[PDB]
């Protein structure tokens, strides 16, 4: 298995473990590279699909 490193987005990356989410408590979180800290609450915003 040979891995070629070219000037490409390199789609073949691999897996990454995920954990259960907790709400109503200050916590540091990672959301697909979005790193933050705070409390997560059920929201009302009408996020259109994309």
């Amino acid at each position: 298995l040979s891995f070629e490193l070219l000037h490409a987005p390199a789609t073949v990356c691999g897996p990454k473990k995920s954990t259960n989410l907790v709400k109503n408590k200050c916590v540091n979180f990672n959301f697909n590279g979005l790193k933050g800290t705070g409390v997560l609450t059920e929201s009302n915003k009408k996020f259109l699909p994309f």
């Binding site: 000037h7 490409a8 987005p9 789609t11 259109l48």
Partner: protein
């Protein structure tokens, strides 16, 4: 063209990495010569 406002939502994102300088369109034709619908 009609007068109005309507934003264009994204639809396609392709990681190709090609130059692209020239482009052409395509259309569908039917044999009767041939008859093509009125379009612009």
């Amino acid at each position: 063209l009609p007068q109005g406002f309507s934003a264009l939502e994204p639809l396609v994102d392709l990681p190709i990495g090609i130059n692209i300088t020239r482009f052409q369109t395509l259309l569908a034709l039917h044999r009767s010569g041939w008859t093509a619908g009125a379009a612009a």
